Amino acid sequence: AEEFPVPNGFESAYREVDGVKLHYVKGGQGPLVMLVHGFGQTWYEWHQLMPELAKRFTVIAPDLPGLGQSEPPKTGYSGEQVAVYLHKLARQFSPDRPFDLVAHSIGIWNTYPMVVKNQADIARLVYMEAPIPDARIYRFPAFTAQGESLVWHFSFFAADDRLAETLIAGKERFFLEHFIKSHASNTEVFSERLLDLYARSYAKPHSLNASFEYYRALNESVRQNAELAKTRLQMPTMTLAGGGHGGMGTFQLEQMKAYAEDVEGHVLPGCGHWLPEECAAPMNRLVIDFLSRGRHHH
Amino acid sequence: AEEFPVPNGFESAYREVDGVKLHYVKGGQGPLVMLVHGFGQTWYEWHQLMPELAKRFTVIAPDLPGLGQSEPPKTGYSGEQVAVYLHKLARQFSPDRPFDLVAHSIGIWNTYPMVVKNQADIARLVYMEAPIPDARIYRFPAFTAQGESLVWHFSFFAADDRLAETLIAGKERFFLEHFIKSHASNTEVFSERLLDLYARSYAKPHSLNASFEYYRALNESVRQNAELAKTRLQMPTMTLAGGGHGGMGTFQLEQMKAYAEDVEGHVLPGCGHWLPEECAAPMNRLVIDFLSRGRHH
Question: Any CB–CB contact under 8 A between B248 and chain A?
Answer without folding.
Answer: no
